[PDB]
Structure 1
């Protein structure tokens, strides 16, 4: 995992969340509902996109033939050229395999980061009005209607509005 969220305390992800990478799934009086978090999604996409823009890019270094495929060059220089080329092929094959492995490990860890980042943002919005259930959910210890859930999502939820209600419910 690293960060411990994806493939971790969040056992499994959601095939039905299709407007984003991360999202919320609530349950209240009016019933269940699902919505994607744009900001955390756009943060991950922007960062992965940045890796892509860095690799998908123009080598402007021209190379020319030193070799001849039709009328073969002198055997000694040819063998040096072949040895030299093969040596460089080893280098680039290594450089490429490692780049990808390293980039991939980071890309997985980065996406895990943005999940942990969002979970802990919500945890903090809820102050002492909720409790971590251990699986990626908060037991919201007060009544939270469709407008209130929306306040959690768009980062306007005022905890001191529901604190007294929740303090009480927690006992």
Structure 2
């Protein structure tokens, strides 16, 4: 989105990313590695779930026939009653239309904030010898093929497996 275009991220899909929505790519002599993160994809699915439950709660009075209307005597009153039903419906519909759209805007945009987090999770585990590009990428003093990256995706990665300095929580 607007953040991704400006701070030169990549509007690139990685159709390799099967098991998840957001994760890491890994580049070098091995070619390109790709791995989903199974918490960013889960945490995104949560919000959405709870957002549904949110949209569902809304209650709107039943809207029914008029108790003392009378279908041949009171047509003009009965007619205004339809107007009422129509307007009510058309009103509450536009409101919901808004609620959802807002809701979507939320979800859609939040995606970039996943990526952004996922980067910071990465920065931790790569240790102080890595170099934060700003790209959403890191130049690392060691090679990282598919296996290495999968540890990165799982949070069972350890720098110094390639003897390099490490932050320890």
TM bin, normalised by shorter chain, reads 0.7 to 0.9
Deviation at 1:158, TM superposition (A): 3.2
TM-score by length of 2: 0.74
2:151, 2:157 within 8 Å by CA — same for their partners in 1? yes
Report SS of the residue matched to 1:38: coil
2:165 to 155, 159, 163: 163
User: CA–CA distance in 1 between the matches of 2:110 and 2:59?
Assistant: 28
2:4, 2:112 within 8 Å by CA — same for their partners in 1? yes
Q: Which moved more, 1:36-45 or 1:75-84?
A: 75-84
1:24, 1:34 within 8 Å by CA — same for their partners in 2? yes
1:130, 1:138 within 8 Å by CA — same for their partners in 2? yes
Q: Which moved more, 1:113-122 or 1:44-53?
A: 44-53
Describe the shift of the 1:15–1:26 C-alpha distance in structure 2 as closer, same or farther (beyond 3 A): closer
Q: How does 1:46-57 map to 2 (within 5 A)?
A: 46-55=46-55
**Equivalent position of 1:169 in the other structure:** none
1:5, 1:115 within 8 Å by CA — same for their partners in 2? no
**Equivalent position of 2:131 in the other structure:** 131
Runs of 5+ in structure 1 lacking a partner? 165-171
Describe the shift of the 1:157–1:18 C-alpha distance in structure 2 as closer, same or farther (beyond 3 A): closer
Q: Which moved more, 1:83-92 or 1:54-63?
A: 54-63
TM-score by length of 1: 0.73
Q: CA RMSD in A?
A: 3.2
